[PDB]
Curated annotation (Swiss-Prot), chain A:
Crosslink (Glycyl lysine isopeptide (Lys-Gly) (interchain with G-Cter in ubiquitin)) position: 106
Catalytic residues identified in the record: 550 (for malonyltransferase activity)
Subunit note: [Alpha(6)beta(6)] hexamers of two multifunctional subunits (alpha and beta).
Other information: Present with 91800 molecules/cell in log phase SD medium.
Region (Dehydratase): 1-368
Stretch list, region Malonyl/palmitoyl transferase: 369-587
Gene label: FAS1
Family, as annotated: Belongs to the fungal fatty acid synthetase subunit beta family.
Domain MaoC-like intervals: 265-390
Name by which UniProt lists this protein: Fatty acid synthase subunit beta
Organism: Saccharomyces cerevisiae (strain ATCC 204508 / S288c)
Swiss-Prot record, chain B:
UniProt miscellaneous comment: Present with 17000 molecules/cell in log phase SD medium.
Function of the protein: Fatty acid synthetase catalyzes the formation of long-chain fatty acids from acetyl-CoA, malonyl-CoA and NADPH. The alpha subunit contains domains for: acyl carrier protein, 3-oxoacyl-[acyl-carrier-protein] reductase, and 3-oxoacyl-[acyl-carrier-protein] synthase. This subunit coordinates the binding of the six beta subunits to the enzyme complex.
Subunit structure: [Alpha(6)beta(6)] hexamers of two multifunctional subunits (alpha and beta).
Residues in cross-link Glycyl lysine isopeptide (Lys-Gly) (interchain with G-Cter in ubiquitin): 37
Family: Belongs to the thiolase-like superfamily. Fungal fatty acid synthetase subunit alpha family.
Organism encoding this protein: Saccharomyces cerevisiae (strain ATCC 204508 / S288c)
Residues bearing the modification Phosphoserine: 50
Post-translational changes noted in the entry: 4'-phosphopantetheine is transferred from CoA to a specific serine of the Acyl carrier domain by the C-terminal PPT domain. This modification is essential for activity because fatty acids are bound in thioester linkage to the sulfhydryl of the prosthetic group.
Protein known as: Fatty acid synthase subunit alpha
Length: 792, 94
């Protein structure tokens, strides 16, 4: 065996031959500077057609993950050499080879110098032989980029339990302390030592960065187990701090108590969801090459058994067996073409288990399947079978889904029985709905679930008993802090509700599911529940962007940001709803002289753009003396929603209908014919339109223009200047309800797209200044003035 | 900048945003020029009861991202949760 290590050293290792080294001592491989030649040669050897690994000018030439062995192999194989790990290298089996790009590591560039480091974990003496699993940690610019995990096997009889050991870094486990017996359980646990013994654990999530060192006596008996690591708590800021230690030490153990605890009373950090049916991607025929020399030269794996007839024959192998890692890389390349959509960056990980042996010039067939997800990364199961109908290779491939931007639907889209099926079928759906339902019943004594299901016409709220008192209490709490002449004009909602009000009636014309204070919770609630179902399925990429239309923004930020909880969401969205219901004068029917028109700029005229309609609404609003503006810039020159006065909507509809009937453009006549003529010539059209619009009663029906479409049942002018006065109370609410801690900038940063400023959420002096210009505010003006004081 | 200072700044920035989104015109065009163009979004999922923002994302694409997208060979998926739940869940019928 020592001569066999010597000779494999000469063919493999480029160091001075000495096997006298500690396996437990971490191995450092020499820097391997990647070159575009070595990538090109390796890509042609493996048969990689991907454009990512082609040397195209301007763009930075990506590195195939397969090449990660060429850098690493030097250190990786080197782990099998020690006089501690004795065995014949000829009857060495490559069992499993795993590559995992650590999340945040961009794939290797062409000008990189990669630091190679390998550590020896799993030296287990099986009755069948000796399994050695070694962890190769590869780093660029000091930061780890990928992990190279290799499991190797010595065939024979290894009763070497003295130097047998297991040094696994046990996964972290979160433990939610809701009940009083749970803290009783952890305090009953001897190994749970705290920094401060008095530390309250109630409503806390405790993580254990625990790792276990086991020395063996037998194949199952562990001669000594040392399971230890720091116990941290998730703080309200969601920073982690060490509050205790696990320092479990025992002798003749048959297993770990902590692991048994965890499989009954511990929850794994990561679960890989399953699809009902594995999606059939493809079944692709791989073929081994006539010679392994073009792969062996680039790879540096100079085991003659792959090339040498005489070696293969001495080893009882049926021929010069093709490099398994060759066929592995060849099959991933097919995963990259088919399941990575011809992208190298979409690969996270790739594990390949070599089951059977493969010879040169064989007709393999690879059955690929899309089986699963895990936190936005698709799970791909591939198996490789030979002509003999024998499965030779297995493997799993975690693949990142690309950028998926979310758009959350606003109001008007509400219907009866919306999201009922999902409410029955999904667990997370049930949980969202039930949580929001319980909040509404304990807080405001109504079932939003009742209202979405059946939509009562009128809904009574009875303050009849002890329960009725706590409901009525907060029904006096909501107010309008409206700004009128610089002084707070506080208007409480439901002036009728007082200390001697026993019952109030929510009154709708057709059904209370139409009134915005019930649309907004219902819409938002369903969307949240649906997204929680998507997250329980793990189908949401973490790189995703997200925006909303009017109301949807609140649903989008609640979902993708988790800035405000379900009880926070419902209270703020219901506050919005009633704050926009009672920001306008209404009647018994809840009819206000306000609404919206979705205007098609191309319909009135193709040459009619969005700067022409912005001029038309700016001139109509001043000439009429009514209030209307553009509130939603939906599609460029195809749909602009204008909210304002019902007479102001009707006159603008008449103006744009007459302009289309006359077939005259305002942009041609203003710049090309006469200057400041179409201004006084527009005011006669606006007069003509406004005199007919005003005559019609205050509850006038909104009718469809040739460009314009009437938003049905929009009493409120949402996003209009009309409710700029209602901003002062809403901000006063938002500061009380959104918390310092609960905002996570990184999870917001470049991901949340606000409706005011359609620029990714960024915390920089330029973005605050852009917000201050777009709408002046004393907090952000103060912050930009005092910017350099918050940095230090 | 300190963590808790940034948590103060990001909260007050959010309170501003929602408070004025309350009563200000939504520049939804420039969001559609952020994620479709600048981020080059390859999947548009409308989390809604009815596909409308799917309609506005599609009509933005076939107007000003018909020639820009086909040059980069990128495949846009205009999804809404209401109609294309199959494709978001990835559950094709045989």
């Amino acid at each position: 065996n020592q001569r066999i290590k010597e000779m494999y050293w000469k063919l493999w290792i480029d160091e001075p031959f000495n096997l006298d080294f500690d396996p437990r001592d971490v191995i450092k491989g020499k820097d391997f500077e990647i070159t575009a030649k070595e990538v090109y040669d390796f890509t042609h050897a493996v048969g990689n057609n991907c454009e990512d690994f082609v040397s195209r000018p301007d763009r930075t030439m990506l590195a195939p993950m397969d090449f990660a062995i060429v850098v690493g192999w030097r250190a990786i194989i080197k782990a099998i050499f020690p006089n501690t790990v004795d065995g014949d290298l000829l009857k060495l089996v490559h069992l499993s080879n795993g590559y995992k790009m650590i999340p945040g590591a961009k794939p290797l560039q062409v000008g990189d110098v990669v630091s190679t480091t390998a550590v020896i974990e799993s030296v287990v003496n099986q009755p069948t032989g000796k399994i050695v699993d070694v962890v190769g940690t590869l780093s660029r610019n000091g930061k780890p980029v990928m992990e190279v995990t290799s499991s190797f096997f010595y065939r024979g009889n290894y009763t070497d339990f003295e130097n047998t050991f297991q040094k696994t870094v046990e996964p972290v486990y979160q433990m939610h302390i809701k009940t009083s017996k749970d803290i009783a359980v952890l305090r009953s646990k001897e190994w749970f030592q705290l920094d401060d013994e008095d530390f309250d654990l109630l409503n806390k999530t405790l993580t254990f960065e625990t790792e276990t060192e086991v020395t063996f006596k037998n194949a199952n008996i562990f001669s000594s187990v040392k399971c230890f690591g720091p116990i941290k708590v998730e703080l309200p800021t969601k920073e982690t701090v060490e509050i205790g230690i696990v320092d479990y030490e025992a002798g003749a153990s048959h297993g770990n108590p902590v692991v048994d605890f965890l499989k009954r009373n511990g929850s794994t950090l990561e679960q890989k969801v399953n699809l009902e049916n594995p999606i059939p991607i493809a079944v692709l025929d791989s073929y081994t090459p006539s010679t392994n020399e073009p792969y062996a030269r680039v790879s540096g794996d100079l085991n003659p058994i792959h090339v040498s007839r005489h070696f293969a024959s001495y080893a009882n192998l049926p021929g010069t067996i093709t490099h398994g890692m060759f066929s592995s890389a060849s099959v991933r390349a097919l995963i990259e073409n088919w399941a990575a959509d011809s992208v190298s960056s979409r690969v996270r990980g790739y594990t390949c288990q070599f089951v059977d042996m493969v010879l040169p010039n064989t007709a393999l067939k690879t059955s690929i399947q899309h089986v699963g997800m895990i936190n936005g990364r698709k799970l791909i199961k591939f198996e490789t079978r030979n002509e003999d109908d024998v499965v030779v290779l297995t493997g799993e491939a975690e693949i990142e889904q690309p950028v998926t931007t979310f758009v959350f639907t606003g109001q008007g889209s509400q219907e009866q029985g919306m999201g009922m099926d999902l409410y029955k079928t999904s667990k997370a759906a049930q949980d969202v709905w039930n949580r929001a339902d319980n909040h509404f019943k304990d807080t405001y004594g109504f079932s939003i679930l009742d209202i979405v299901i059946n939509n009562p016409v009128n809904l009574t709220i009875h303050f009849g008993g002890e329960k009725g008192k706590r409901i009525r209490e907060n029904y006096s709490a909501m107010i309008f802090e409206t700004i009128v002449d610089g002084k707070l004009k506080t208007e409480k909602i439901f002036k009728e509700i007082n200390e001697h009000s026993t019952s109030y009636t929510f009154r709708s014309e057709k059904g209370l599911l139409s009134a915005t204070q019930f649309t907004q919770p219902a819409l938002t609630l369903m969307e949240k529940a649906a997204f929680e179902d998507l997250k329980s399925k793990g189908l949401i990429p973490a790189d995703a962007t997200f925006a909303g239309h009017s109301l949807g923004e609140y649903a989008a930020l609640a979902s993708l940001a988790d800035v405000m909880s379900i009880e926070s969401l419902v209270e703020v969205v219901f506050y919005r709803g009633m704050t926009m219901q009672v920001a306008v004068p209404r009647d018994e029917l809840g009819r206000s002289n306000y609404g919206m028109i979705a205007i098609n700029p191309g319909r009135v005229a193709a040459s009619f753009s969005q700067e022409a309609l912005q001029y038309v609404v700016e001139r109509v609003g001043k000439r009429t003396g009514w209030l209307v503006e553009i509130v939603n810039y939906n599609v460029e020159n195809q749909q602009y929603v204008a909210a304002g006065d019902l007479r102001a909507l009707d006159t603008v509809t008449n103006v744009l209908n007459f302009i289309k009937l006359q077939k005259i453009d305002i942009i041609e006549l203003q710049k090309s014919l006469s200057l400041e003529e179409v201004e006084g010539h527009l005011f006669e059209i606006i007069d003509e339109a406004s005199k007919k619009s005003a005559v019609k009663p205050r509850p006038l029906k909104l009718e469809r223009g040739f460009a314009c479409i009437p938003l049905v049942g929009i009493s409120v002018p949402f996003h209009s200047t009309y409710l700029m006065n209602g901003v002062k109370p809403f901000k006063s609410f938002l500061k009380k309800n959104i918390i310092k801690e609960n905002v996570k900038v990184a999870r917001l940063a470049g991901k949340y797209i606000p409706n005011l400023t359609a620029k990714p959420f960024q915390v920089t002096k330029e973005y605050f200044q852009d917000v201050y210009d777009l709408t002046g505010s004393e907090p952000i003006k103060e912050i930009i003035d005092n910017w350099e004081k918050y940095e230090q | 900048m300190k963590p808790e200072v940034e948590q103060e700044l990001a909260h007050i920035l959010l309170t501003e945003l929602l408070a004025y989104q309350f009563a200000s015109p939504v520049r939804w065009i420039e969001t559609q020029d952020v994620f479709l163009k600048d981020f080059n979004t390859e999947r548009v999922v409308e989390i809604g009861p009815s596909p409308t923002l799917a309609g506005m994302a599609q009509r933005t694409l076939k107007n000003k991202y018909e020639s820009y997208d086909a040059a980069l060979s990128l495949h846009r998926e205009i999804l809404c949760y209401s109609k294309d739940a199959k494709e978001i869940y990835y559950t094709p019928d045989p």
